[PDB]
Design a protein around this ligand. Structure first.
Ligand SMILES: Nc1nc2c(ncn2[C@@H]2O[C@H](COP(=O)(O)OP(=O)(O)OP(=O)(O)O)[C@@H](O)[C@H]2O)c(=O)[nH]1
Ligand SMILES: [Mg+2]
Lengths: 251, 277, 50, 1341
DNA sequence: CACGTATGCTATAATGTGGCAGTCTGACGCGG
DNA sequence: TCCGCGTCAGACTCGTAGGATTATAGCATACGTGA
């Protein structure tokens, strides 16, 4: 692909495939030319070296260094490592309708609630706004609804308030050691950029407000909303899964 | 424990015969007439020559072995077009061929994108000029400074230095250690975001509803022209192929369809709202 | 260490008491950075098995 | 005796220990080191001189041609730091080197009388270090961090068990050169000595001695002692050495003369030994059976046959003894090997050694490094000599040879860089001594073995690499070419050297963006030591032992300043007084104690020197101008601490502060803080963003002023004198005649840097400290930098703080702040962002920067001017266009919708796109500045041209004012010289100054002075002309940009950020917090006096944290402000200068045993009221580190303020008006707003762009990224029920392409149904496994 | 034909290669 | 069976910043597709 700078950027698999093709075609040539066998042998060694580098570089001894000096990333390297494709792109992923910010106390909150910044929530529930806007006939179409949100018009806040009502949001803190590292809350729209967390659940998250941050995630489907409200809600996860002793307790 | 492809091959080469002058002449006459053994022996005996130039041709593009193999291709052509009738020695003639084939391979296989030797040769002169300029101008060559020295076009010099830019690895990370790779920063552009794709689904859907809102003869020549409903995007004069068969009446009716549709966008709440877009 | 720190934080530790404290402190902090990963590797082996 | 800037505001000192040595320049390391690299020394191989003489002269392979080095020179820098920073170029000097191509005849033997060609060739630009200690690389200020590595020399180490559950301690020697292969010796469980060359495969240690040409008998004569056996008549005899037996058990009855000394089977004690020695025992009769096992030393052969009866190093028997006797040998040299002390190690190693002679040994060594390749004798000799005995490939360095020689107990320090045969044997000897039990193992963590490489050494090494790459090219071209046409510059290439150095100063790990949040951040960054990067440890490699603070770190490295992270213990801040010895070891100052009396004689001791002496502690009480008060002084030696008598004491700690680094020295009551919290405190001070009003710290230490001055961010007066002209831009000082040189005009101009961008986008602003017409001395602060008060370092703002709960608004470290803080714009912070717009040339054609942009509102284009550039001063918000840019589009094919749409508005707008630079979404600011970089050939923008008009006229004005103020200042001197011996006061002023070339006086010294001033005037006249032509050329000059790029427009935005909930604040005792709420003034707890508290911090975040420093700071802070409130009250009521003087003298001279005396009196009345006006906003106090203020001193100070001794007050709740039920601690804590603003961290995403291969959303807020849903987070949903939430997160939220769009459409349609698919990551996985040649199919239902 | 891209040919003799890895570490197998 | 190189492992999100280098001769004859 072309970078903006006019330059190109490519996978190392291209360099490994080009190795293999050059040496393979040179082998075809030296066979057509009836070359003496010492030279044929050298080319057959080099061909096996190139294929073995292409499949799994570094297993067959010294890995082929590209441009920096770093060994070229081969096929097997894209599957194998923790960074491969299993651990990185398949047993966990980056996710839509996800946000984060610094957390801060919400002592006024009830146990099942959390302060969610206005501008953050505006963005996370964009399709839900578009949808209600068109059912009220306030927006003629989607692009007009988008421009009404961009302008952040006063009527849009009232609609956003209506969507967030009774809609649970997942809060997550790293590290997620046990299941209570994710909990669902009913959000409360707040002016300001910080997430407000209920004190009593700070124990489960191991949350202390000296700058910790949290991930927000929006359960989209009716099923996901119900699983959040019934199974993952703060109120419903009072006792720990490990011992019977509860974790929800003020200090 | 000799496992290395290189040390094995260099062991095999050392294990050859070294040729003399009269021996080169005897073998060369037999070789050009078409001897099997003469060709093999001349090649195998002169492999050492390939290596000595191949060793002084590394760290540029390919590896030592890669250069050694392409250099060997030069040796073969050298044995084929060697003239034993000329009193002058083989080693001198072969050196040309080995250097030629190595250089040519280094100009092709190295550059990821196949580049022509014509542009490469021009580039060489631009770079050599830059070297001489750098020694006298303590700074480095400008494109314009180089262009003035060769009496050539600034544009042509810039085009050339634009093909010199090396390609960067996407698999290689940037964030200090291994935090993120260039792949994960760089998004798929030809692919639209779901917000953009959904916006087009709404326009296309609106058009179907907009087609059943105007006149039956006003959306039969407005859409069959743009290729909205039709199969082919026709022009004012080409709408005559269907049933319209007019030039004046088609142009009046196209714009009549658009004027009534402009009022449909002013009333729904777009017009100047959707003008910025 | 054979000589204990008789002085406390209220009274103020001497240059030597503070320097001696450092060892334990930093080993604690390095422990949190480095040892967290064997604990976590055990979580992950357990999870995969069950 | 106080300086002018101290007369304005004096800090009260609670220190009691008189400082014999002042804090040195804190940025000494960076400057000294790099200065050595560029420094031209004829002899002293340092940096470049060394580099050239090392490589050069390079002679050709043929030997006819050679290139030799003469000398080098740095051209002056093409661009100043200023122009480099703006343009984005490296600040460097061109390196021009004189080189002589000399050629020899092949026909004559070594006739040098053929061709000598000498010329000055360019080899790269070298980046230059700034006066501050930084490099500007591609327009960015960077610091190269000093490195900490294993010193070359020898090290004797030992696996303490590890290998072999046998649990055997295997001793090893490692010889580490500065350059070359490593030489290892090691023991095996079976006590066989082995050599690893370059840590390759194992070889028997004796093999290396055979390679050095040692016969078997010579080897044994080296390691083993000889014992002589005489065979007399029939009985066996042996020559006894009285001691040898010693602690052995007697195996035979030992009879001497005729009389029995030992009983057989009893242990020989000291009495037997002295009896035998005094009797002079030399022969003892022994049984023949005792020799079975003894090792013969030499080869013994039959003189009759001439054949070998027994070879050297062979185990003797009864029959070999018999054969030896009858051959005619009645003397047998045998080895001494008695287990325990004298082990037979080398004896057993020779039996393991398969090699025989020298050649066989050299072959085996050759076969190890190059296995397979056949030996030749020439090849094996060459390889072995080129390993450790070649001057070019092996170099211990001065430090290596020195540490090597001291480790082997030599007398001579200096010597050869190459290993001698003697060296290797001595090392083996010491190894074996250590195995025996006499001699000890060296420490790797010991600072005596860890050496510091600052910049100059590292720049030197990269420069040598460049030269080595060049040497191959050069030698290659010298041999091939004809010698006579060919000059030296056609052979040299500059690009290799330039590339080596460029890669160091730009790509290197140790070269990193200067941490410029604040002065302390900068100063501490430049004095960093890293064990990481090239030639060092890695995070993988780094254990637990290296990371921990050793006892040698005392006075050299800070024990309490290290990143809390993966880098914990590898990165270290330098101590205060610490410095590098000549060889690069760290050293610390100590006061010599002579005959018990403690002199002011000060000695810097290295890590190794320190171990040897007993050093008293700094807190040790000295008696009034002589010896120690106390009999048993508390000291430290041999790395451990206890009581000593006075006569034993050798030395003493110079300051109480020398243990600590700079950052930690700024923490007041460090003594009362846990070391962990203190670490994070020193770490967060570096994160402190300077506020709009730089407020001094009320509770300081005294390092405040040192740091502010040495950081360089303050303008300091070199010359002093009286200030001629102040301005919010410049300070001109007229110098005093005593420092003012009579050559040039004596007027100093300091130009101040106004509101400029930092690397962290903070604001750098210099304001003038002094007023118009103020007298100043050398080293007075003339202008304050960003986070500095009158000369002192001011990282944040002190505040009235009360420790008490609020309604959970301070739950877990959460902070409750008064609205008054926001109103007073305290912790309001200034941020300057740099945005660039690049006009490139594409295959379709050049991009245009016109205001003429397709599909754009008049609202947007209003703010752009003719060229398409936003106006200076214009406020902008996300989506507003800053620089309009359009890109040529090739294919114009449209979807039918777009054909219709473009037909409706008729806004065809040709075929141009919109790629305009617009304000990033949610950032909003004012445009402060615009810069345009254009190429040479292309027609300039209208806006670019008006910018050049401004720069030209402004340049003209700048230079004109230079020549004007310089001419006025110069004639003002001529006027004074002419009066000297020629009274013409009023008569000289009336005729024009321009017609003063005629004016002279009689030929004396004064006429020569007039000539100096006249030649300078005209020199300045032409100088002004050539300066102006240079400026004009640079302004017209079209800058050479990246290929493809026609022009670049840089916009600078300014932003005022207010303090707000989510923002991170901390103190200096590692006490952090996030602001939870801003309380109305009415609501905040208030005093009996009615004054509301600024910040309400939670009491529960103190006793657990064990940082009690913050509480002492608060009590003293209130006492400081108590006295400020008294002075404020006396200044409001005018009152008497006498009365103010009384109160203030009693105040400064309070402390029980205050070191600092302040005999107020000498202060003039005007000095006193300027001083009181500064002391009014709270008397600033200094608590040194470990010599701080005592509780009793703080309570005494509180009584002087009429504040309570408890420092707790009655508080009233702002809401209810009722009193709080118990007293609350209130006072002033100096607080810091860290760089972590909520403004920068909040991020949210519904849908966005998606990754190239994996199709998952991108990461990071800059890429508008989705949060990563990790394995850990997935497992949580697995533990719950939540299967749909999980599938969502896997599929329509990430890869599933069809699914995500379909579900988006459903959510706008309000269906809230998933319709899942197949994740694209999995499709890729399949393709990647099939690319391996494994068939992986989906099997259908 | 022509521009871009490629293959071609040259003659003093010359004829066996060579830049790093810095020893992480406990763990668990697979040849001699 | 045992000493030993070999091979496989080493918490979770956030950030920052962009990125490099070298040189391959002069010339003519040649093969390939669009006008
Ligand atoms: N997950 C994670 N947590 C960290 C890391 N570094 C520090 N922490 C957490 O930061 C917190 C800092 O101290 P606190 O949580 O306030 O400690 P505490 O258990 O409340 O005890 P006190 O300080 O006495 O109140 C701890 O919970 C740590 O677990 C890290 O690298 N990863
Ligand atoms: Mg806590």
């Amino acid at each position: 692909v072309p970078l903006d700078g006019g330059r190109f950027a490519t996978s190392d698999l291209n360099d490994l495939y080009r190795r293999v093709i050059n040496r393979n075609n040179r082998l075809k040539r030296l066979l057509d030319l009836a070359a003496p066998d010492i030279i044929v042998r050298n080319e057959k060694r080099m061909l096996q070296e190139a294929v073995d580098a292409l499949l799994d570089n570094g297993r067959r001894g010294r890995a082929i260094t590209g441009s920096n000096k770093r060994p070229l990333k081969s096929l097997a390297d894209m599957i194998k490592g923790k960074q491969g494709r299993f651990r990185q792109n398949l047993l966990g992923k980056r996710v839509d309708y996800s946000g984060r910010s610094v957390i801060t106390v919400g002592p006024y909150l009830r146990l099942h609630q959390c302060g969610l910044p206005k501008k953050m929530a505006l963005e996370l529930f964009k399709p839900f706004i578009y949808g209600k806007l068109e059912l009220r006939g306030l927006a003629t179409t989607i692009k007009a609804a988008k421009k009404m949100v961009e302008r952040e018009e006063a009527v849009v806040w009232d609609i956003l308030d209506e969507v967030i009502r009774e809609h649970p949001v997942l809060l997550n803190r790293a590290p997620t050691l046990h299941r209570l590292g994710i909990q669902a809350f009913e959000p409360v729209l707040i002016e300001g950029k910080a997430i407000q967390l209920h004190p009593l659940v700070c124990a489960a998250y191991n949350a202390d407000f000296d700058g910790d941050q949290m991930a927000v995630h929006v359960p989209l489907t009716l099923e996901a909303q119900l699983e959040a409200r019934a199974l993952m809600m703060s109120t419903n996860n009072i006792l720990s899964p490990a011992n019977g002793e509860p974790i929800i307790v003020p200090s | 424990r000799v496992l290395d492809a290189t040390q094995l091959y260099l062991g095999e080469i050392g294990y050859s015969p070294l040729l003399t002058a009269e021996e080169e002449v005897y073998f060369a006459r037999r070789a050009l007439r078409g001897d099997v053994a003469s060709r093999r022996r001349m090649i195998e005996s002169n492999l050492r020559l390939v290596v000595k130039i191949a060793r002084r041709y590394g760290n540029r593009g390919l590896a030592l072995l890669d250069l050694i193999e392409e250099g060997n291709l030069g040796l073969i052509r050298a044995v084929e077009k060697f003239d034993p009738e000329r009193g002058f020695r083989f080693s001198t003639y072969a050196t040309w061929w080995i250097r030629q084939t190595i250089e040519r391979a280094i100009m092709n296989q190295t550059r990821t994108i196949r580049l022509p030797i014509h542009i490469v040769k021009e580039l060489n002169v631009y770079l050599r000029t830059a070297r001489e300029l750098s020694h006298k101008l303590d700074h480095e060559p400008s494109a314009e400074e180089i262009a003035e020295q060769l009496d050539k076009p600034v544009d042509d010099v810039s085009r050339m230095l634009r093909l010199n830019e090396r390609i960067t690895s996407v698999d290689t990370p940037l964030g200090g250690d291994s935090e993120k790779a260039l792949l994960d920063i760089l998004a798929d552009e030809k692919e639209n975001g779901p917000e953009d794709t959904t916006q087009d689904d709404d326009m296309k859907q609106s058009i179907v509803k907009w087609l059943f809102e105007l006149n039956a003869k006003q959306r039969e020549v407005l859409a069959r022209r743009f290729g909205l409903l039709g199969y082919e995007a026709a022009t004012l004069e080409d709408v005559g192929r269907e049933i319209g068969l007019t030039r004046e009446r088609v142009r009046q009716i196209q714009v009549e369809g658009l004027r009534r549709l402009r009022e449909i966008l002013q009333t729904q709440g777009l017009n100047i709202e959707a003008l910025f877009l | 260490i054979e000589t204990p720190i008789t002085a406390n934080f209220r009274e103020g530790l001497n240059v030597l008491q503070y320097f001696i404290s450092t060892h334990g402190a930093r080993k604690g902090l390095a422990d949190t950075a480095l040892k967290t990963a064997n604990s976590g590797y055990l979580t992950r082996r357990l999870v995969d098995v069950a | 005796v106080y300086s002018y800037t101290e007369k304005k505001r004096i800090r009260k000192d609670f220190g009691k220990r008189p400082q014999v040595l002042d804090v040195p320049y804190l940025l000494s390391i960076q400057l000294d080191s790099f200065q050595k690299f560029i420094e031209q020394d004829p002899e002293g191989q340092y940096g470049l001189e060394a580099a050239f003489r090392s490589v050069f002269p390079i002679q050709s392979y043929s030997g006819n041609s050679e290139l030799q080095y003469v000398s080098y020179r740095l051209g002056e820098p093409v661009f100043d730091v200023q122009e480099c920073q703006i343009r984005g170029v490296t600040y460097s000097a061109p390196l021009r080197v004189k080189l002589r191509l000399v050629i020899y005849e092949r026909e004559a033997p070594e006739g040098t009388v053929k061709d000598i060609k000498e010329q000055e060739v360019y080899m790269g630009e070298i980046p230059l270090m700034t006066d501050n200690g930084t490099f500007v690389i591609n327009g960015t200020e960077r610091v190269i961090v000093s490195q900490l590595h294993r010193s070359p020399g020898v090290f004797f180490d030992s696996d303490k068990g590890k290998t072999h559950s046998s649990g055997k301690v295997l001793y090893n020697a490692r010889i580490i050169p500065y350059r070359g292969s490593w030489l290892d010796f090691e023991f095996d469980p079976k006590d066989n000595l082995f050599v690893r060359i370059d840590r390759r495969r194992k070889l028997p240690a004796t093999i290396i001695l055979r390679a050095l040409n040692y016969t078997t008998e010579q080897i044994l004569d080296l390691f083993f002692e000889k014992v002589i056996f005489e065979i007399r008549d029939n009985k066996l005899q042996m020559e006894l050495v009285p001691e040898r037996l010693r602690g052995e058990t007697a195996s035979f009855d030992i009879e001497a003369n005729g009389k029995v000394y030992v009983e057989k089977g009893r242990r020989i004690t000291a009495r037997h030994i002295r009896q035998l020695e005094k009797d002079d025992v030399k022969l003892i009769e022994v049984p023949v059976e005792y020799i079975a096992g003894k090792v013969v030393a030499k080869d013994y052969i039959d003189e009759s046959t001439g054949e070998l009866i027994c070879a050297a190093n062979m185990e003797l028997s009864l029959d070999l003894l018999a054969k030896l006797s009858q051959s005619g040998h009645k003397r047998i040299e045998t080895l001494f090997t008695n287990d325990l002390d004298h082990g037979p190690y080398i004896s057993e190693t020779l039996r393991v050694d398969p090699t025989n002679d020298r050649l066989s040994a050299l072959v085996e060594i050759y076969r190890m490094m190059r296995p397979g390749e056949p030996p030749t004798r020439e090849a094996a000799e060459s390889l072995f000599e080129n390993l450790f005995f070649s001057e070019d490939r092996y170099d211990l360095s001065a430090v290596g040879r020195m540490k090597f020689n001291r480790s082997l107990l030599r007398e001579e320090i200096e010597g050869s860089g190459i290993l001698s045969k003697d060296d290797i044997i001595d090392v083996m000897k010491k190894l074996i001594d250590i195995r025996n039990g006499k001699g000890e193992v060296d420490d790797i963590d010991h600072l005596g073995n860890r050496r510091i490489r600052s910049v100059g050494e590292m720049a030197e090494n990269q420069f040598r690499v460049g030269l080595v790459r060049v040497e191959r090219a050069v030698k290659e071209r010298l041999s091939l070419g004809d010698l006579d046409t060919l000059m030296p510059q056609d052979m040299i290439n500059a690009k290799p050297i330039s590339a080596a150095v460029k890669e160091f100063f730009g790509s290197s790990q140790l070269s990193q963006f200067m941490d410029q949040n604040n002065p302390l951040s900068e100063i501490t960054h430049k004095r960093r030591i890293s064990a990481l990067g090239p030639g060092g440890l890695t995070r993988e490699r780094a254990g637990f032992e290296v990371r921990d603070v050793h006892p040698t770190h005392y006075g050299r490295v800070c024990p309490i300043e290290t990143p809390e992270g993966p880098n914990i213990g590898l990165i270290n801040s330098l101590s205060v007084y610490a410095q590098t010895n000549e060889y690069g070891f760290l050293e610390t100052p100590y006061r010599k104690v002579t005959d018990g009396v403690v002199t002011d004689e000060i000695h810097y001791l290295s890590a190794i020197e320190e171990g040897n002496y007993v050093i008293a502690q700094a807190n040790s009480n000295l008696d009034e101008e002589g010896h120690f008060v106390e009999d048993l002084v508390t000291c430290r030696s041999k790395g451990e601490s206890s009581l000593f008598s006075r006569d034993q004491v050798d030395y003493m700690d110079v300051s109480t502060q020398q243990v600590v680094s700079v950052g930690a020295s700024l923490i007041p009551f460090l003594e009362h803080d846990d070391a962990n919290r203190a670490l994070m405190g020193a770490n967060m001070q570096r994160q402190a963003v300077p506020t709009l009003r730089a407020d001094k710290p009320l509770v300081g230490t005294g390092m405040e002023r040192a740091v502010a001055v040495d950081s360089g961010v303050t303008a300091v007066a070199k010359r002093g004198g009286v200030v001629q002209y102040v301005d919010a831009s410049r300070i001109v000082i007229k110098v005093n005649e005593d420092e003012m040189y009579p050559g040039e005009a004596g007027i100093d101009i300091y130009n101040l840097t106004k509101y400029t961008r930092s690397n962290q986008n903070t604001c750098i602003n210099q304001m003038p400290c002094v007023s118009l017409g103020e007298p100043v001395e050398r080293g007075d602060v003339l202008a304050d930098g960003p986070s500095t008060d009158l000369g002192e370092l001011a990282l944040g703002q002190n505040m009235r703080v009360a420790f008490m709960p609020w309604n959970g608004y301070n739950f877990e470290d959460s902070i409750l702040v008064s609205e008054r803080v926001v109103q007073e714009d305290r912790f309001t912070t200034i941020h300057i962002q740099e945005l660039a717009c690049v006009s490139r040339d594409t295959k379709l054609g050049p991009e245009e920067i016109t205001a003429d942009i397709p599909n754009v509102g008049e609202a947007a284009l209003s703010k752009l001017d003719e060229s398409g550039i936003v106006y200076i001063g214009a406020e902008v918000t996300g989506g507003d266009i800053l620089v309009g840019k359009v890109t040529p589009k090739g294919e114009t094919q449209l979807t039918p919708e777009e054909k219709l749409l473009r037909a409706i508005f008729g806004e065809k707008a040709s075929d141009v796109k919109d790629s305009s630079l617009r304000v990033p979404n949610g950032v909003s600011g004012t445009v402060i500045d615009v810069q345009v970089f254009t190429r040479d050939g292309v027609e300039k923008d209208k806006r670019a041209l008006e910018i050049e008009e401004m720069q030209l006229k402004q340049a003209k004005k700048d230079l004109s004012e230079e020549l004007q103020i310089l001419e006025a200042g110069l004639f003002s001197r001529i006027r004074a010289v002419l009066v000297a011996g020629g009274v013409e006061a009023e008569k000289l002023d009336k005729l024009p100054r321009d017609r003063w070339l005629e004016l002279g006086l009689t030929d004396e010294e004064k006429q020569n002075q007039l000539e100096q001033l006249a030649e300078q005037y005209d020199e300045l006249k032409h100088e002004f002309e050539k300066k102006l032509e240079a400026k004009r050329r640079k302004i017209t000059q079209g800058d050479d940009l990246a290929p493809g790029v026609l022009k670049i427009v840089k916009v600078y935005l300014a932003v005022k950020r207010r303090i707000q909930p989510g923002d991170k604040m901390a103190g200096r005792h590692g006490n952090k917090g996030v602001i939870s709420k801003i309380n109305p003034i009415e609501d905040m707890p208030y005093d009996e006096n009615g004054t509301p508290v600024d910040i309400v911090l939670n009491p529960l975040g103190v006793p657990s944290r064990m940082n009690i420093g913050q509480i002492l700071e608060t009590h003293l802070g209130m006492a400081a402000k108590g006295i400020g409130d008294k002075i404020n009250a006396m200044l409001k009521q005018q009152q008497e200068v006498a009365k103010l003087r009384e109160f203030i003298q009693r105040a400064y001279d309070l402390g029980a045993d205050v070191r600092q005396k302040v005999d107020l009196s000498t202060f003039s009345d005007e000095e006193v009221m300027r001083l009181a006006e500064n002391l009014r906003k709270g008397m600033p106090i200094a608590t040194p580190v470990f010599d701080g203020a005592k509780e009793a001193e703080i309570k005494e100070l509180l009584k002087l303020g009429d504040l309570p001794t408890s420092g707790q007050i009655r508080l009233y709740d702002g809401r209810t008006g009722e009193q709080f039920e118990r007293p609350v601690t209130v006072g002033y804590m100096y607080m810091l707003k860290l760089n972590h603003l909520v403004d920068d961290k909040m991020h949210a995403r519904s849908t966005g762009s998606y990754s190239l291969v994996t199709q998952q959303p991108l990461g990071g807020k800059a890429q508008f990224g989705g949060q990563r849903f990790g394995e850990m987070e997935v497992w949580a949903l697995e533990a719950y029920g939540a299967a749909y939430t999980l599938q969502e997160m896997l599929t329509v939220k990430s890869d599933d392409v069809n699914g995500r769009t379909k579900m988006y459409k459903n959510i706008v349609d309000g269906n809230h149904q998933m319709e899942p698919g197949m994740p694209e990551s999995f499709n890729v996985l399949l393709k990647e496994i099939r690319s391996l040649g494994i068939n992986i199919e989906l099997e259908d239902e």
